[PDB]
Design an enzyme around this catalytic site. Structure first.
Site, PDB file in Angstrom:
ATOM      1  N   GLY B 137       0.858  -1.235   0.014  1.00  0.00           N
ATOM      2  CA  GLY B 137      -0.033   0.095  -0.090  1.00  0.00           C
ATOM      3  C   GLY B 137       0.864   1.337   0.041  1.00  0.00           C
ATOM      4  O   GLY B 137       0.521   2.249  -0.681  1.00  0.00           O
ATOM      5  N   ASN B 199      11.987  -9.038  -9.578  1.00  0.00           N
ATOM      6  CA  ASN B 199      12.556  -9.858  -8.566  1.00  0.00           C
ATOM      7  C   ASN B 199      12.781 -11.160  -9.602  1.00  0.00           C
ATOM      8  O   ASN B 199      12.218 -12.199  -9.081  1.00  0.00           O
ATOM      9  CB  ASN B 199      11.577 -10.097  -7.437  1.00  0.00           C
ATOM     10  CG  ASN B 199      11.993  -8.963  -6.546  1.00  0.00           C
ATOM     11  OD1 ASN B 199      11.200  -8.575  -5.677  1.00  0.00           O
ATOM     12  ND2 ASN B 199      13.357  -8.473  -6.657  1.00  0.00           N
ATOM     13  N   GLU B 247      20.429  15.534 -19.657  1.00  0.00           N
ATOM     14  CA  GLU B 247      21.227  14.744 -20.975  1.00  0.00           C
ATOM     15  C   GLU B 247      20.543  13.390 -21.367  1.00  0.00           C
ATOM     16  O   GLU B 247      20.128  12.937 -22.313  1.00  0.00           O
ATOM     17  CB  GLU B 247      22.626  14.512 -20.879  1.00  0.00           C
ATOM     18  CG  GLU B 247      23.597  14.260 -21.651  1.00  0.00           C
ATOM     19  CD  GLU B 247      23.758  15.095 -23.005  1.00  0.00           C
ATOM     20  OE1 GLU B 247      22.996  16.214 -22.814  1.00  0.00           O
ATOM     21  OE2 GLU B 247      24.230  14.859 -24.023  1.00  0.00           O
TER      22      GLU B 247
HETATM   23  N1  GTP Z   1      13.769  -5.350  -2.917  1.00  0.00           N
HETATM   24  C1  GTP Z   1      13.274  -5.665  -1.780  1.00  0.00           C
HETATM   25  N2  GTP Z   1      11.946  -6.181  -1.596  1.00  0.00           N
HETATM   26  C2  GTP Z   1      11.301  -6.249  -0.558  1.00  0.00           C
HETATM   27  C3  GTP Z   1      12.187  -6.231   0.823  1.00  0.00           C
HETATM   28  N3  GTP Z   1      11.216  -6.389   1.865  1.00  0.00           N
HETATM   29  C4  GTP Z   1      10.252  -7.025   1.209  1.00  0.00           C
HETATM   30  N4  GTP Z   1      10.154  -6.919  -0.060  1.00  0.00           N
HETATM   31  C5  GTP Z   1       9.237  -7.559  -1.105  1.00  0.00           C
HETATM   32  O1  GTP Z   1       8.775  -6.475  -2.088  1.00  0.00           O
HETATM   33  C6  GTP Z   1       7.472  -6.617  -2.228  1.00  0.00           C
HETATM   34  C7  GTP Z   1       7.027  -4.962  -2.382  1.00  0.00           C
HETATM   35  O2  GTP Z   1       7.264  -4.314  -1.215  1.00  0.00           O
HETATM   36  P1  GTP Z   1       6.465  -3.153  -0.716  1.00  0.00           P
HETATM   37  O3  GTP Z   1       5.280  -2.987  -1.683  1.00  0.00           O
HETATM   38  O4  GTP Z   1       7.190  -1.976  -0.541  1.00  0.00           O
HETATM   39  O5  GTP Z   1       5.505  -3.696   0.658  1.00  0.00           O
HETATM   40  P2  GTP Z   1       5.300  -2.809   1.882  1.00  0.00           P
HETATM   41  O6  GTP Z   1       5.626  -1.424   1.492  1.00  0.00           O
HETATM   42  O7  GTP Z   1       5.763  -3.264   3.029  1.00  0.00           O
HETATM   43  O8  GTP Z   1       3.672  -2.847   2.055  1.00  0.00           O
HETATM   44  P3  GTP Z   1       2.790  -1.716   3.128  1.00  0.00           P
HETATM   45  O9  GTP Z   1       4.000  -1.322   3.962  1.00  0.00           O
HETATM   46  O10 GTP Z   1       1.678  -2.382   3.763  1.00  0.00           O
HETATM   47  O11 GTP Z   1       2.213  -0.648   2.130  1.00  0.00           O
HETATM   48  C8  GTP Z   1       6.799  -7.060  -0.829  1.00  0.00           C
HETATM   49  O12 GTP Z   1       6.046  -7.848  -1.339  1.00  0.00           O
HETATM   50  C9  GTP Z   1       7.744  -7.924  -0.160  1.00  0.00           C
HETATM   51  O13 GTP Z   1       7.716  -9.383  -0.186  1.00  0.00           O
HETATM   52  C10 GTP Z   1      13.366  -5.305   0.680  1.00  0.00           C
HETATM   53  O14 GTP Z   1      13.943  -5.170   1.704  1.00  0.00           O
HETATM   54  N5  GTP Z   1      13.854  -5.113  -0.605  1.00  0.00           N
HETATM   55  N1  GDP Z   2      37.528  14.704 -31.848  1.00  0.00           N
HETATM   56  C1  GDP Z   2      36.968  15.027 -30.659  1.00  0.00           C
HETATM   57  N2  GDP Z   2      35.676  14.531 -30.512  1.00  0.00           N
HETATM   58  C2  GDP Z   2      34.826  14.945 -29.386  1.00  0.00           C
HETATM   59  C3  GDP Z   2      36.024  15.414 -28.428  1.00  0.00           C
HETATM   60  N3  GDP Z   2      35.003  15.525 -27.178  1.00  0.00           N
HETATM   61  C4  GDP Z   2      33.776  15.221 -27.476  1.00  0.00           C
HETATM   62  N4  GDP Z   2      33.950  14.633 -28.812  1.00  0.00           N
HETATM   63  C5  GDP Z   2      32.759  14.278 -29.736  1.00  0.00           C
HETATM   64  O1  GDP Z   2      31.996  15.294 -29.996  1.00  0.00           O
HETATM   65  C6  GDP Z   2      30.602  15.549 -29.752  1.00  0.00           C
HETATM   66  C7  GDP Z   2      30.230  16.807 -29.482  1.00  0.00           C
HETATM   67  O2  GDP Z   2      29.421  16.550 -28.413  1.00  0.00           O
HETATM   68  P1  GDP Z   2      28.906  18.120 -27.576  1.00  0.00           P
HETATM   69  O3  GDP Z   2      28.076  18.904 -28.686  1.00  0.00           O
HETATM   70  O4  GDP Z   2      30.155  18.832 -27.047  1.00  0.00           O
HETATM   71  O5  GDP Z   2      27.985  17.384 -26.364  1.00  0.00           O
HETATM   72  P2  GDP Z   2      27.430  18.709 -25.389  1.00  0.00           P
HETATM   73  O6  GDP Z   2      28.690  19.352 -24.619  1.00  0.00           O
HETATM   74  O7  GDP Z   2      26.627  17.950 -24.418  1.00  0.00           O
HETATM   75  O8  GDP Z   2      26.585  19.648 -26.110  1.00  0.00           O
HETATM   76  C8  GDP Z   2      30.453  14.339 -28.810  1.00  0.00           C
HETATM   77  O9  GDP Z   2      29.358  13.601 -29.176  1.00  0.00           O
HETATM   78  C9  GDP Z   2      31.642  13.406 -28.735  1.00  0.00           C
HETATM   79  O10 GDP Z   2      31.511  12.186 -28.961  1.00  0.00           O
HETATM   80  C10 GDP Z   2      37.236  15.926 -28.591  1.00  0.00           C
HETATM   81  O11 GDP Z   2      38.113  16.197 -27.567  1.00  0.00           O
HETATM   82  N5  GDP Z   2      37.838  15.463 -29.848  1.00  0.00           N
END
Ligand code: GTP
Ligand code: GDP
Ligand code: GDP
Ligand code: MG
Ligand code: MG
Lengths: 52, 433, 44, 60, 428, 427
Positions: B137, B199, B247
């Site tokens: 819940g 799971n 990004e």
């Molecule tokens: N990944 C993970 N799953 C868990 C863990 N403990 C229980 N679960 C299982 O994950 C499922 C989903 O968990 P929840 O939906 O969060 O259950 P809950 O929050 O205790 O339910 P309520 O508190 O009554 O609202 C449950 O059916 C559990 O069997 C845990 O520590 N980690």
């Molecule tokens: N030749 C060269 N290529 C690069 C270098 N750095 C990044 N690149 C490539 O050039 C592309 C340019 O990306 P960019 O526009 O700078 O990404 P932004 O910074 O998020 O805008 C990237 O996809 C990289 O794969 C570099 O130093 N030399």
């Protein structure tokens, strides 16, 4: 009561974004300003607009 | 000066975060109480006070006081702010309507009060990072109200959730199909991206890849710990090519309603087995598209990949990955979709992963995190939709949900909402000529 | 004069290459690491 | 089974050897100051094309 | 005396740009502090082409640096050079450009336009004359293609007479990095063709190809892939900086290079790049061997000349040579195979020389090529975009950022116009 | 030779002035004790303009330290360099002036002013021929505003021709320290416009704003606020104090500065305020000074001139200047952007090149140019006043100490006269 609540909640949302409202009165009418004025506040505007 | 806020909700969510937060402290060299043993890499998941104390940026919330107590009185007592580490009043007790209407309602105001007090200390905030479940819940209904309120209070912040899907074959909760259908109205247009960790992955990856038999949840959560550390490390550790959170969002996701990627952590190998082979960039990329290594019990051969995002860590050269991508694109078995010919990313981080003490993972020169968006997750709902309508047909286990204030018609509204979402993956899987 | 200039230029590149390779054996043998790039629990 | 999370204290041989961090000490200063803005006025010499200052001597 | 100011936008633009300032400081005898420590007086007598003179001895390079992620600014400042750079000249935003052209050109990159056009203006009035502009960027993300094209537009009205140069890193299908690279590049080059005078195209695939096939090294990361490859071509401006025999500056080289005022996309090259082992196996003269670069194993673009015709060729040379054998090799490279050259332009090749070669090489050359086969690099990304535009793959991160559907069609049509002209003068 | 006596008033003026007497001491090579250890005799030539000459190798400042609060005077007496200040020149009352103009001008203010007048008369009588007095305070605070305007009114009655150079901190528009800054400022502006002959309009917001981005210091405390105001008023008197290529004094500045004798509120500015992590790259020469002088940020009045046309401009240049290069830039700034320059004055730029370099720096100037934009503050404080006047807000604890309604209206009317005078002289 439930109906007038949304009326008195959406009246608060728009009236609390008034800073945004003043800026959006510039992104309309005088358009071609929106790219470099939109994501700003009321004080960034009127100072950015000073630069222009 | 850029940071990522996390919120962990549910029993499942809180304990997979204990494996997340043990890894964050052991990555950056932070003691279990807060002070550095004696950079700016702390300022993504950690806030630095006047002393050396690093208060964590998470807020752990659950309605069961039992699971919140062992982290309140555990070895992470001095780490967490004791008012951040918020408890509940009564168990949600595996009921969506309980966690959404009657007993999860008296905790929304205090949870959102702490998100405001945490986001104003923030200065360069990128987005939220959610952690919940689909079965109980408070893992399903209480996070539904969270996506309801965070969408209107924040808006343009990009939220990401690492959901734990109901398993197709085994299961632990009877009414968890009910909880995994009604949550879908609030994970579709109120979630920007939604990672699914079923799971059935560490159910058998911990058996075949790792030589340890009989795994338990403290080993389930470490792999979920590794992937989140791999994703955010581009925000956090320098690299030859970094992938920001914003990004990563616009590149992997095709469509506003198609934001449900798969997951894969390839170099999951034991210590006694890792020295028996070399772990190259090409080998660890070829081992990540295999249908026996994905994080969801779904065969990727049925579907076609839309766009894949790859994040590499540690010692990786950016020529071998380009050779790896070209070698793995030319194989016919892994078939991509026609309208996205590139369909790939690379991401480089210099720092190799850490291994926690007692872990069964072996540390590596290079670790790749493959995040794939498939239309093979269309049939992830097929064994859940047939799981759903068989129980729903004769009003089984409905009197509890309508007994807690939830209207009957909201069951069928979520039914048609997922039916339309299944239709979207049939629409995008058709080629256009 | 141009013949000896080319004679002296090629052996200068031979002299540059052995100094280039002797620079190798300095960093290869000593291998400094900055404490900024080490883990806080590795330093002592 | 949740006490085993922070149970074993680390060895000097668990964490990675290359703690390559992010070192934002300079950009944190640059963001604090406002980026440069020309709310300043004309100070331009009349930059001319070829020839800098004509003598016009011995004739004209 | 004759000034050009450098523009740096993008992570790729900054990394290539920073490495460019390492090469020229090595050549001009400038240290990573600013002071001069070289030998010849022929190095400082044209320090006023790229560098500005600080209080005493120090030379601060004029180069605007801009990105939306401050991590790249931290890398260039804490780098093997960097203290020469001007902190006031460093300008950035808060959040990244998100690999989206629309957000890096309209809604997030437009807040920095006033600040980036300022540091251009303050580096434009300190010039005795502004010979031209120079930009290093890329066509992958919004930092280099988004804001970069926004830098192209905003500078063009203020300085229309002055030429302006861009160092573009165009995408390739074999080296795929971003799924939005076919969206970003086909819409950027709409703004690289209207308001630029000459541009260069350096794709990563040919950067990997010549670094493996010729240089004989095993792991080409990006640092050594620019020092001896990409930043050596950027020294084409040695005619502005060094005495030559007859020399062509950035104005002279480009004016008789581009044939028509909207067809300027060029293929760069660097001639001496032998190996670290086979350098003492061949001769550093100019026979028909090291001067016939028709085989594209020494080329910085994917498309080879074999699939097109050369419109105009330029080659700047370095070192103590005579200008007959370079001139008779022009006779020997045009008349040996004239079927790959434009007929109505009888002289298709240009030669410029400078007397000061780069250190370590007694003879150097840099090659620039205008080919009608460059459409093969543009036609391939056309079908990368049309197949991805027919289903509207990643469109809505452009639609919500103030730009409508029509600007995609205009960008697709203008490239389809550009590929048609490269096809129209293919044989004539 | 010529002499200047400083009449530091209140918190504000003493903190500015004691650090101003710091800078002058360091400029003259004067130690915390007061003994001259400077090298150049040019410091020692006109040292008596500031340093009245005591015994034991030592000079004392002419600063008549004036305050009413018991402990503003204890700060400057216990200051690092506070030993130079004469103990008789430390006159202080035994009550606080309540940040009200009224109590600082009629009852609690006007008892020390008798004792204050005695010692300033002594200091001027000790010297030979005064160029003009100096005074620093803030219009916001009580004894800054009230007792401050008590001085100049009662000073001019037996120093008429001496120029009254009162360098006051008109209260910051954005940064509001005192709630009742509007009342105290308005009454003072009313008694400076006919009273003082030269006033520099100084705003803590602009003092902040300069030091955020130009001096790069992330925390503009009260120290570097006192750095900036000290530097603009060492500059206006340095060209009297020190040898100059083009000599200019306090009288010589003002006769070249104020066109009509009620426009005394000038707008100060100091050019080389470079970032201390960025002084390495400046090429610190004439054109970048003149650019930085004529810059909306680098002026300590929070107003931006732009709207207001420069009625007159000064440039009191410090250092070794190319004289051509100064002369060219002064036209080149003026001719190229002639919109914010009055047309009825063809050339309103004043230059005052002085030979000696600035302290540590190579070369500087002091822009104190008169714009008609100064009214923007006087418009802001006026509305700030009438917002509180219209319901007689803090007027209740004003009439008790000796106000009336009439002086409140007269001060507001004179300040409407002052803005209208600025609007009328701009064409
Ligand atoms: N990944 C993970 N799953 C868990 C863990 N403990 C229980 N679960 C299982 O994950 C499922 C989903 O968990 P929840 O939906 O969060 O259950 P809950 O929050 O205790 O339910 P309520 O508190 O009554 O609202 C449950 O059916 C559990 O069997 C845990 O520590 N980690
Ligand atoms: N030749 C060269 N290529 C690069 C270098 N750095 C990044 N690149 C490539 O050039 C592309 C340019 O990306 P960019 O526009 O700078 O990404 P932004 O910074 O998020 O805008 C990237 O996809 C990289 O794969 C570099 O130093 N030399
Ligand atoms: N500029 C400046 N102002 C100061 C300093 N220390 C105190 N103050 C100012 O003093 C003003 C308060 O007025 P104040 O003189 O204390 O009231 P009064 O003593 O009754 O006249 C405030 O506006 C503060 O700005 C300082 O070092 N510099
Ligand atoms: Mg529970
Ligand atoms: Mg004179």
């Amino acid at each position: 009561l439930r109906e007038e609540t949304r009326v008195l909640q959406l009246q608060l949302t728009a009236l609390l974004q008034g800073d945004e409202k003043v800026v959006q009165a510039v992104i309309r009418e005088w358009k071609s300003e929106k790219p470099y004025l939109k994501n700003r506040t009321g004080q960034q505007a009127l100072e950015h607009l000073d630069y222009r | 000066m850029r940071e990522c806020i996390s919120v962990h909700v549910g029993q499942a969510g809180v304990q997979i975060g204990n494996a997340c937060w043990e890894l964050y402290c052991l990555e950056h060299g932070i003691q279990p109480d807060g002070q550095m043993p004696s950079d700016d890499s702390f300022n993504t998941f950690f806030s630095e006070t006047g002393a050396g104390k690093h208060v964590p940026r998470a807020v752990f919330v659950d309605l069961e006081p039992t699971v919140i107590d062992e982290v309140r009185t555990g070895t992470y007592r001095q780490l967490f702010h004791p008012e951040q580490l918020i408890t509940g009043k009564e168990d949600a007790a595996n009921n969506y309507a309980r966690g959404h209407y009657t007993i999860g309602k008296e905790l929304i105001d205090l949870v959102l009060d702490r998100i405001r007090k945490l986001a104003d200390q923030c200065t360069g905030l990128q987005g939220f990072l959610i952690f919940h479940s689909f079965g109980g819940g408070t893992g399903s209904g209480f996070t539904s109200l969270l996506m309801e309120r965070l969408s209107v209070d924040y808006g343009k912040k990009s939220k990401l959730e690492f959901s734990i899907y109901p398993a197709p074959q085994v299961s632990t909760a009877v009414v968890e199909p009910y909880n995994s259908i009604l949550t879908t109205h609030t994970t579709l247009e109120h979630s920007d991206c939604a990672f699914m960790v079923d799971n059935e992955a560490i159910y058998d990856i911990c058996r075949r890849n790792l030589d340890i038999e009989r795994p338990t949840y403290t080993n389930l959560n470490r792999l979920i710990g590794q992937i989140v550390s791999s994703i955010t490390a581009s925000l956090r550790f320098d690299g030859a090519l970094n992938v920001d959170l914003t990004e990563f969002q616009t590149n992997l996701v095709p469509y506003p309603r198609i934001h449900f990627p798969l997951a894969t952590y390839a170099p999951v190998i034991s210590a006694e087995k890792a020295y028996h082979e070399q772990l190259s960039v090409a080998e660890i990329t070829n081992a990540c598209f295999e249908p026996a290594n994905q994080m969801v019990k779904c065969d990727p051969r049925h579907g076609k990949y839309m766009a894949c995002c790859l994040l590499y860590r540690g010692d990786v050269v950016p020529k071998d990955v380009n050779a790896a991508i070209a070698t793995i694109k030319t194989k016919r078995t892994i078939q991509f979709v026609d309208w996205c010919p590139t369909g790939f990313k690379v991401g480089i981080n210099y720092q190799p992963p850490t291994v926690v003490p007692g872990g069964d993972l072996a540390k590596v020169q290079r670790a790749v995190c493959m995040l794939s968006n498939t239309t093979a997750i269309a049939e992830a709902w097929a064994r859940l939709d047939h799981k759903f309508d068989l129980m729903y047909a004769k009003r089984a286990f409905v009197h509890w949900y309508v007994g807690e204030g939830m209207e009957e018609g909201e069951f069928s509204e979520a039914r048609e909402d997922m039916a339309a979402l299944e239709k979207d993956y049939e629409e995008v899987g058709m080629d256009s000529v | 004069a141009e013949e000896e200039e080319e004679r002296r230029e090629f052996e200068a590149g031979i002299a540059a290459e052995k100094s280039f390779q002797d620079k190798i054996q300095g960093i290869l043998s000593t291998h400094q690491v900055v404490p900024r790039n080490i883990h806080p629990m590795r330093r002592a | 089974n949740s006490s085993n999370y922070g149970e074993f204290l680390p060895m000097p041989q668990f964490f990675p050897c290359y703690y390559t961090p992010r070192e934002q000490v300079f950009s944190s200063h640059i963001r604090a100051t406002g980026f440069y803005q020309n709310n300043t006025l004309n100070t331009a010499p009349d930059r001319t094309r070829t020839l800098d200052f004509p003598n016009f001597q011995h004739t004209l | 005396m004759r000034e050009i100011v450098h523009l740096q936008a993008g992570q790729c633009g900054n990394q290539i740009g920073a490495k460019f300032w390492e090469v020229i400081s090595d050549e001009h005898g400038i240290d990573p502090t600013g002071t001069y420590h070289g030998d010849s007086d022929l190095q400082l007598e044209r320090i006023n082409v790229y560098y500005n003179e600080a209080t005493g001895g120090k030379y601060v390079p004029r180069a605007v640096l801009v990105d939306l992620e401050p991590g790249t600014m931290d890398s260039v400042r804490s780098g093997p050079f960097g203290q020469i750079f001007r902190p006031d000249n460093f300008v950035f935003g808060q959040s990244g450009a998100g690999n989206n052209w629309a957000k890096g050109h309209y809604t997030e990159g437009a807040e920095l336009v006033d600040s980036v056009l300022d540091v251009v203006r303050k580096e434009a009035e300190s010039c005795d004359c502004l010979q031209g502009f120079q930009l290093t960027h890329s066509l992958g993300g919004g930092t280099g293609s988004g804001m970069g094209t926004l830098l192209i537009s905003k500078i063009r009205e203020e300085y229309p007479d002055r030429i302006m140069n861009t160092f573009s890193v165009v995408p390739s299908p074999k080296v795929s990095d971003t799924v939005v690279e076919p969206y970003n590049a086909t819409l950027s080059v709409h703004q690289l063709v209207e308001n630029t005078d000459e541009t260069y195209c350096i794709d990563n695939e040919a950067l990997y190809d010549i670094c493996f096939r010729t240089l004989k090294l095993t792991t080409p990361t990006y640092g050594d892939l620019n020092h001896l490859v990409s930043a050596t071509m950027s020294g084409v401006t040695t005619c502005l900086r060094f005495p030559g025999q007859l020399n062509a500056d950035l104005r002279k080289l480009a004016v008789n290079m581009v044939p028509f005022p909207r067809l300027h996309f060029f293929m760069p090259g660097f001639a001496p790049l032998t190996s670290r082992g086979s350098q003492q196996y061949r001769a550093l003269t100019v026979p028909e061997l090291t001067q016939q670069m028709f085989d594209a194993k020494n080329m910085m673009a994917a498309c080879d000349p074999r699939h097109g015709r050369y419109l105009t060729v330029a080659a700047v040379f370095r070192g103590r040579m005579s200008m007959k054998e370079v001139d008779e090799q022009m006779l020997n490279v045009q008349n040996k195979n004239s079927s790959y050259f434009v007929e109505w332009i009888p002289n298709n090749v240009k030669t410029a020389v400078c007397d000061i070669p780069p250190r370590g090489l007694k003879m150097s050359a840099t090659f620039i090529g205008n080919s009608t086969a460059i459409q093969e690099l543009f036609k391939r990304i056309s079908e990368q975009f049309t197949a991805m535009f027919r289903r509207k793959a990643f469109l809505h991160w452009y639609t919500g950022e103030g730009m409508d559907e029509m600007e995609f069609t205009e960008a697709e049509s203008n490239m389809n116009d550009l590929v048609s002209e490269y096809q129209q003068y293919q044989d004539a």
